[PDB]
Every structure is written in C-alpha cells, then in structure tokens.
Amino acid sequence: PSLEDLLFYTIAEGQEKIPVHKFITALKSTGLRTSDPRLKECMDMLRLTLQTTSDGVMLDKDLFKKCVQSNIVLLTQAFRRKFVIPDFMSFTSHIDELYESAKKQSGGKVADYIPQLAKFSPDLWGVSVCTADGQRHSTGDTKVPFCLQSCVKPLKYAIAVNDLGTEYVHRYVGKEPSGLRFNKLFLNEDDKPHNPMVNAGAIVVTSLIKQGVNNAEKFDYVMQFLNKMAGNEYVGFSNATFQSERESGDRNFAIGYYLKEKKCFPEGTDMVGILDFYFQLCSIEVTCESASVMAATLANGGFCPITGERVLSPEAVRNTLSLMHSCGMYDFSGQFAFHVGLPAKSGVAGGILLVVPNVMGMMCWSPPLDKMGNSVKGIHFCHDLVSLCNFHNYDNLRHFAKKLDPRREG
Amino acid sequence: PSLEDLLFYTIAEGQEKIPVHKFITALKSTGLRTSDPRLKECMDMLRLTLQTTSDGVMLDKDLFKKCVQSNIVLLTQAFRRKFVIPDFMSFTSHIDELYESAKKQSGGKVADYIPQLAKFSPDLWGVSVCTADGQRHSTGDTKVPFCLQSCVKPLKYAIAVNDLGTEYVHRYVGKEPSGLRFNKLFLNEDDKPHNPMVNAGAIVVTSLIKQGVNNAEKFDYVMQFLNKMAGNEYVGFSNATFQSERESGDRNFAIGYYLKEKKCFPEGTDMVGILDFYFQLCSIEVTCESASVMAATLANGGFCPITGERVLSPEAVRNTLSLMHSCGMYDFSGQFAFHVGLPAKSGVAGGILLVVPNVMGMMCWSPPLDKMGNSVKGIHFCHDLVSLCNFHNYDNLRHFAKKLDPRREG
Ligand SMILES: O=C(Cc1ccccc1)Nc1nnc(NC2CCN(c3nnc(NC(=O)Cc4ccccc4)s3)CC2)s1
Ligand SMILES: O=C(Cc1ccccc1)Nc1nnc(NC2CCN(c3nnc(NC(=O)Cc4ccccc4)s3)CC2)s1
C-alpha cells in the first residue's frame, strides 16, 4: 500500500487524475491555509509543476505522489478528518454568526489617554481563529495592526517562566487575583505584586527577563520569542505608542518607585530602564491573525501549531493559562472566569487574547472598551462562543446538554 | 457473530467454558465493582445460576450470554479498554504510591472546636477514586464515616442552581473569591456574600433550597439528592456534630443576623431556622467511597457514573466546578488553583472533595488540618497527583512533558 496513494484515491474519486484546483479546494476546506509553513515543500512542488507542464493541469497518482511526499503526514491527518475540529467549514460558519452578532454591539468608548488609540475607528472589529492543528479562519478587520498593550503581559510572563522556572519568578510576583477592591494596592501582604497580569506584576516580570543585557537586546530577545509564538506572522512595534506611553505613564512611574523602595526588583535592576522596556513591550504590534497564532501556541502546550516548533515549556504555558483564567480581564476577571471559563487577556487597544486549551487560540479586536477596560464586542463574542460550544473550562466533554461540540462529527 | 459471543471468546482464552471466578476476576480488573448498580441484572443472573448447582461453576457461551446480555454494552466497554482510564490496575498502583507518600506527612492539627471532630484519630487517612465510568479504587480508611462540613457547600449550591437556575441563585450570592484579605468581610460591595463556598454564601444558598417547605422536608429533599449523587452509597447524619455545631456557631449566628439586617435572604426566610438547617447540612456524613461517587457525578457532567442517572443539570455542575476551582480551599484557594488546577472543596473534618473533570472524582480524608484549615495529607496528595498526571486544568492533553496520562493506552 502507500500513504500518498491511498490519500490519492481519497481525493481521486474513482477518476484517474485530480485537477490541481480540486486538490487545493479540498486542502483549504480542512482549514489549513495554502501558505502554511508545514506545507511549503508541497506547495512549491505544485507551483513548479504548473510551470513545467502547462500541458495540464492535472495530477496523476505519481505526480500527486511527488508533490505531497514531504508533507504527507500532515496532509493525511487533514484529509482523514483527524484535526481537532474535523468539520472546520461548519465551525467557521458559527464563528461568522457570532462575529455578526457582536458587530451589532456598538457601545463602549475607544481609549483616548494617548493619541495613538483615540486614532482608532470604533467600528473596527476582527476575530481570528487558529486551532492547535493550524486551521485558520478570520472574519472582519483581522490584518489591521494594533498594540498588544496588556495582552503582552501573559506572553512576557511565559518567557520569564520558560527561562527561569516557576519558583524563581514567583519569588517576585504572586499567583492570585487581588480581590474586587484591592484593585488599587500595588503589593500583596508578602510585598509582591498580586500576579503577573497587573501592571505592578508585569513591571516586575519585565525586570526578570534577560537580566544583565541592555534594553536593545532584551527587546530583540522578546521579539524573536514573539515571532516564534506567532509562527513568524506579523509582530511589529509602534514607536508613536511607545513615546506617548512613556510621556503619559505617571502611574507606572509611581509603581516603579514604590517597587524600588520596597525592593521588589532583582539586585542590580535599573528601575527607570525597566519602565522604558515595559513601555516598549506594551507598544509591540500584532494583527488578529498573527496574535491568534500566539494564542494557539498557548492552546497547544507551547508548540506553535503552524510551524511545529517548541516555543515555550509546558510549565510556562500552564502557569500563564492559570493566571489568564483568574486575573486576565481586569475587574471583570471573576465574572469572565465564571461565565466564559477560558484563559483570556484584554488590552486597552481592544484586543482580547483568548485560549481554548487543546482546541484553539483566538484574537478578538474592537477598540471600544467598556467601563472595566475590556472590548465590548470581544466580551460579547466570548460569552456567545461559550453559550454555543462546550468550551467552558468546566463544561463536560460527554454531557453538555444543548451546546455544540466542534470536536465531534455526528 | 454477536456481541455477547464476541466478548465470550475474549474472556474464554480458547477454552470452551469460563469459570465464574475467572469472569469476576477479569471484571474487577477493569475497575468495576461487582456491586455496580448498572451490573445488577448480570449479578442477579449469576446469583441464580450459581444456585442451580454447587459445582464449579462454569459458564458455556450460551449461559454466559444469559448472564451478561442485559449489561452487555457496559461489559464490552469495560473489557475492550474503552473506559476513561483503560489501564486502571496500573493507575491504582500510582494512587497507592501517592497515598503512601502522603501517609508520611504527619503534621497538622485535628480540629477540636467541638468534641466530635476532636475524637477522630490523627492517623486516619483514606483516598477513594470513582472514575466517570464507575471504576473504583480505595486505599486506607475509606469506609469510616465523617462529616462533610464545608465539603457540603458545593453540593447544596449545585442543588440550588439545579432547581432555580444560575441567575436567580446569583441574585443572592456572588461568583468570585474575595481576595486574600477581604477574608473577614461577610458581604461584597453589592451586599451579597462573596461566593457560595464561604460560610456567608453557604448560609444564603441554604435559604434558597426548597423554600416554603419546612426544615424537616428540606433536609429530606437534600438527603435524597445526595443519595442520587452518591449512587445510593453511604450518606448519614451526625446529630452529635449537629448539636455541637449549633451551640458553638457564634460566628455563624453573627453572619446570620448580619445577612438578615442587610436583607440578603429571600422574603419569608426564618433566619434562625435556616441556621439550624445549615448546621444539619454540615453534619451530613459520608465515607471516602460514597463521597468520591458524589465527586464523580460532578466530574461526569451531572450523571452519576455508577447508576447512569442524571442528577444535576450541566449548568449546576459547571457553576459548582468553577467556584470550587477558585474558592474551595479557604485562603489556599489561589495557591491550590495555580499549582493543582483542580476544583476541590475542603472541610474541617479533614475531607477534600476533588474533581478531575471528565476523568474522575475523589474524596481524600485525613483529620489533621494545616493552618489554613485544609487536610495536610489531602493537600500533599493533591499536589503529588498533579505532579504525576497531566490532570491540571491547564495541562495540555497532547504536550505534557514527562507527566503521565492515565487516559492513554500509549
Ligand atoms: O500594604 C500592602 C500589604 C497589605 C495588603 C492588604 C492588607 C494588609 C497589608 N500593599 C500595598 N500596596 N500599595 C500600597 N500603597 C499604595 C499607594 C497607591 N495606592 C493608593 N493610594 N491611595 C489610595 N486611595 C484610594 O483608593 C481611595 C478610595 C477610598 C474609598 C473607596 C475607594 C477608593 S489607593 C495603593 C496603595 S500598600
Ligand atoms: O462593607 C462591605 C462591602 C465592601 C467591600 C469592599 C470595599 C467596600 C465595601 N462588606 C462587609 N461585610 N461585613 C461587614 N461587617 C463585618 C463584621 C464582621 N467582620 C469584621 N469586623 N471587624 C473586623 N476587624 C478585624 O478584622 C481586625 C483587623 C483590622 C484590620 C486588619 C486586620 C485585622 S472583621 C467583617 C466586617 S462590612
């Protein structure tokens, strides 16, 4: 027998030759994009075959063989419905409906304490999905770049835990939500920031990464790390946002001096320099599409789903997901954990980085924020998604009443 | 041929007739107990054929069929390794090692604020497992009755959500942990108890159940409900503990009067009567074995795994598991959520009701408590369990480093 051949007969349909466009259409309907880095050899060989034989363009078993050989495992799982969401076309139809429903939620106020966000139209709204198998779907404004802002907090904590371990990192930062009106306290009773998802905690975490090297190399080190998490999709930087943030960051400077006085930083920390680095990390730019791949890396236990590359330790990812679950949505964190039950992180630019463990990552972006600082449409979408699908952390995978389970078929 | 026959040859081993003891021994190693209520018809039929003789006695394919045919689906999944933990004998060996490691953790203090807790030996230590498929294992003192105490709090919250819905229940009680020192406050800022897992929340939740009927019928209703949750294994009542709890429940009376003055109860509540009902609920008795079945009902989306009966709505179970995750272990709740990542609830008698969603429920019981009120051995066991197995809520089911996954053949 042969894997290329019985996959050939799978698409062949009794016919002798597969039209090339018919193979591409079947591939796309699994959810994989033709640009997937794991399919490069196959797509290069297909394009090359369309050049060397315009006497075509139809693939016989042996020419189909030589195109798919290099990527045959991934291609087989895709075509034998082995991906985490088998009927991806049906699922994206649901995502689109959820998207259109949240589109009609027009309230909230765009953040405006800096010029680079008041800039953003209230009506931008994008949602991108990347499953742990690399299946992609986007709807709305998913290639508009925006700053991560606090969405970067779980990512830089994960880097810190990856490089230094749980025990070291959490000598400096706690692991719990603060409680609905210890919002305002910079430190818990052990003189540590409450958790990595608040500014004081994120500032301390920022000071743990790549200690001893200067800010230029620290930033490059973090960027290279975000590139891998995003499978090398768009990660950028907004210098306009950085300059405005550092120029308007009086409270973060208040936090910085308070943490210095309380000796919250590692020995030899230049606190003002860490604040600069912090403002830079908040100014890193993504799109919905690229950020959804970062989320999918966290959903996939530290492996980037569109490259296969191990990016973060399971410990770093587990810790990060734990704290996103309980600390990720500002004062809405307890409500979100109860009703949505998914690890998520929101930012002032309107992003919500969302993780369904073992299923998928998402980025929802809509600049208008509610009074707790969370994107109105993102919050609405997240509630709807879990109303529809049994993705709540404490939904049961066997007894889920009327919810839909996109992991199953019939 | 047919399913009874095709399973007959599996156990037959080429032999022409199966000894009865060889079938029982094979069944037990799947993890099922012969007393499983779903196997009653089969065991009754075995009982009848064991009476027609005093020989072997040995089953030919046709009489085996006559015994097993009523329970053939369940018997097939058990014998063709379809249960959630396929190699259960290997898994119980690990449970045994975890048990023996926690046994040497000899610290902590037995609760003594009333005599009924104060008499329990410091050295009692039991762990019971019930998977979502009804596979059972116990090690240590697992048939000694002890009071649920605060372990009853998630069960009566589940009942209330089951009967009345999330929205009504949470008019009276919040959905969040209070934070590591708004510990002492009875109400959050919306004049509701912070969540159902604290005394103030449980007291209010108690006032929502079976309203309008008197306390005796209320207690009967809750007992019946716990019977279904435990698949009719042991549930009792300690009047001694009840009497002691009510005479030394000064703080609970302080809470009750405070909630009354703040109008936290439904109209027509007799607050002093509700406190009495509350003390009774804390005095309900279980064993490790019966309580692990209750936990397994929560692990199984509201279906009792050893009877098949729907006991709780999926919404009640999801809500209960969410609040156990974040509020279940007193001031250790945040540490426990971060490190163990399992919904759990502890009580002052030393019980820890533990749920691994979609896998199993457990009850750990060891009377000596740490400084936060949690059983020392239970806390140690829970950490060890998640160190060993990829059961952390934010462990990945595909990439889990060196952890063991008992869900996998491979
Ligand atoms: O001490 C501890 C450890 C601890 C914790 C818990 C229990 C015991 C011990 N942590 C600390 N972290 N940060 C501290 N100083 C900060 C200075 C800036 N902030 C603020 N300064 N001033 C305000 N004022 C209103 O916030 C005003 C207000 C009044 C009423 C209602 C709402 C708001 S916050 C927050 C306090 S101290
Ligand atoms: O008000 C709110 C809502 C709220 C929440 C957040 C922000 C604004 C509004 N909830 C309330 N719940 N219960 C209240 N009265 C209770 C009477 C019994 N308890 C206690 N009484 N007295 C103590 N005394 C020390 O606990 C001693 C101590 C003091 C400071 C530090 C450590 C220890 S507790 C708790 C207070 S009020």
Swiss-Prot record, chains A, B:
<dbReference type="GO" id="GO:0090461">
    <property type="term" value="P:intracellular glutamate homeostasis"/>
</dbReference>
<feature type="modified residue" description="N6-acetyllysine">
    <location>
        <position position="175"/>
    </location>
</feature>
<feature type="binding site">
    <location>
        <position position="245"/>
    </location>
    <ligand>
        <name>substrate</name>
    </ligand>
</feature>
<feature type="modified residue" description="N6-succinyllysine">
    <location>
        <position position="28"/>
    </location>
</feature>
<dbReference type="GO" id="GO:0005759">
    <property type="term" value="C:mitochondrial matrix"/>
</dbReference>
<keyword id="KW-0963">Cytoplasm</keyword>
<dbReference type="GO" id="GO:0002087">
    <property type="term" value="P:regulation of respiratory gaseous exchange by nervous system process"/>
</dbReference>
<dbReference type="GO" id="GO:0004359">
    <property type="term" value="F:glutaminase activity"/>
</dbReference>
<keyword id="KW-0378">Hydrolase</keyword>
<feature type="binding site">
    <location>
        <position position="348"/>
    </location>
    <ligand>
        <name>substrate</name>
    </ligand>
</feature>
<dbReference type="GO" id="GO:0001967">
    <property type="term" value="P:suckling behavior"/>
</dbReference>
<feature type="region of interest" description="Highly mobile activation loop">
    <location>
        <begin position="179"/>
        <end position="186"/>
    </location>
</feature>
<keyword id="KW-0597">Phosphoprotein</keyword>
<keyword id="KW-0007">Acetylation</keyword>
<keyword id="KW-0809">Transit peptide</keyword>
<feature type="binding site">
    <location>
        <position position="199"/>
    </location>
    <ligand>
        <name>substrate</name>
    </ligand>
</feature>
<keyword id="KW-0040">ANK repeat</keyword>
<comment type="similarity">
    <text>Belongs to the glutaminase family.</text>
</comment>
<dbReference type="GO" id="GO:0006543">
    <property type="term" value="P:glutamine catabolic process"/>
</dbReference>
<keyword id="KW-0677">Repeat</keyword>
<dbReference type="GO" id="GO:0005739">
    <property type="term" value="C:mitochondrion"/>
</dbReference>
<dbReference type="GO" id="GO:0007268">
    <property type="term" value="P:chemical synaptic transmission"/>
</dbReference>
<feature type="binding site">
    <location>
        <position position="150"/>
    </location>
    <ligand>
        <name>substrate</name>
    </ligand>
</feature>
<feature type="binding site">
    <location>
        <position position="252"/>
    </location>
    <ligand>
        <name>substrate</name>
    </ligand>
</feature>
<feature type="binding site">
    <location>
        <position position="330"/>
    </location>
    <ligand>
        <name>substrate</name>
    </ligand>
</feature>
<dbReference type="GO" id="GO:0005829">
    <property type="term" value="C:cytosol"/>
</dbReference>
<protein>
    <recommendedName>
        <fullName>Glutaminase kidney isoform, mitochondrial</fullName>
        <ecNumber>3.5.1.2</ecNumber>
    </recommendedName>
</protein>
<feature type="binding site">
    <location>
        <position position="278"/>
    </location>
    <ligand>
        <name>substrate</name>
    </ligand>
</feature>
<dbReference type="GO" id="GO:0045202">
    <property type="term" value="C:synapse"/>
</dbReference>
<keyword id="KW-0496">Mitochondrion</keyword>
<dbReference type="GO" id="GO:0006537">
    <property type="term" value="P:glutamate biosynthetic process"/>
</dbReference>
<keyword id="KW-0898">Cataract</keyword>
<keyword id="KW-0887">Epilepsy</keyword>
<keyword id="KW-0225">Disease variant</keyword>
<comment type="subunit">
    <text>Homotetramer, dimer of dimers. The tetramers can assemble into rod-like oligomers (in vitro), but the physiological significance of this is not clear. Interacts with RAF1 and MAP2K2. Interacts with ATCAY; the interaction is direct and may control GLS localization, negatively regulating its activity.</text>
</comment>
<comment type="function">
    <text>Catalyzes the first reaction in the primary pathway for the renal catabolism of glutamine. Plays a role in maintaining acid-base homeostasis. Regulates the levels of the neurotransmitter glutamate, the main excitatory neurotransmitter in the brain.</text>
</comment>
<dbReference type="GO" id="GO:0051289">
    <property type="term" value="P:protein homotetramerization"/>
</dbReference>
